[PDB]
């Protein structure tokens, strides 16, 4: 249960650009870098920046 600090505006389709206030389920990468989170709404996979996310 993390939180999207900001709305990472990715530019490539590889990473999906999420937003702040939306719920995301972290996937891997525990350190601080670019962990991949999966949205529970549709079920897409987007790399949310660690600086743009935070453990609740």
UniProtKB/Swiss-Prot annotation:
Post-translational modification remark: The phosphorylated form is termed pp60c-src. S-nitrosylation is important for activation of its kinase activity.
Domain SH3: start-end pairs: 1-56
Subcellular location: Cell membrane; Mitochondrion inner membrane; Endosome membrane; Nucleus
Tissue/organ expression: Expressed to high levels, and with a high degree of kinase activity, in certain fully differentiated cells such as neurons, platelets and macrophages. Isoform 1 is widely expressed. Isoform 2 is expressed only in the muscle.
Domain of life: Eukaryota
Family: Belongs to the protein kinase superfamily. Tyr protein kinase family. SRC subfamily.
Described function: Non-receptor protein tyrosine kinase which is activated following engagement of many different classes of cellular receptors including immune response receptors, integrins and other adhesion receptors, receptor protein tyrosine kinases, G protein-coupled receptors as well as cytokine receptors. Participates in signaling pathways that control a diverse spectrum of biological activities including gene transcription, immune response, cell adhesion, cell cycle progression, apoptosis, migration, and transformation.
Subunit structure: Forms a complex with polyoma virus middle T antigen. Interacts with AFAP-110. Interacts with GJA1 and PXN.
Protein name per UniProt: Proto-oncogene tyrosine-protein kinase Src
Stretch of the intact protein here: 85 to 140 of 533
């Amino acid at each position: 249960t993390f939180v999207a600090l900001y709305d990472y505006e990715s530019r490539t389709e590889t990473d999906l650009s999420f937003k702040k206030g939306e719920r995301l389920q972290i996937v891997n990468n525990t350190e601080g870098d670019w962990w991949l989170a999966h949205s529970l709404t549709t079920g897409q996979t987007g790399y949310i920046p660690s600086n743009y996310v935070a453990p609740s």
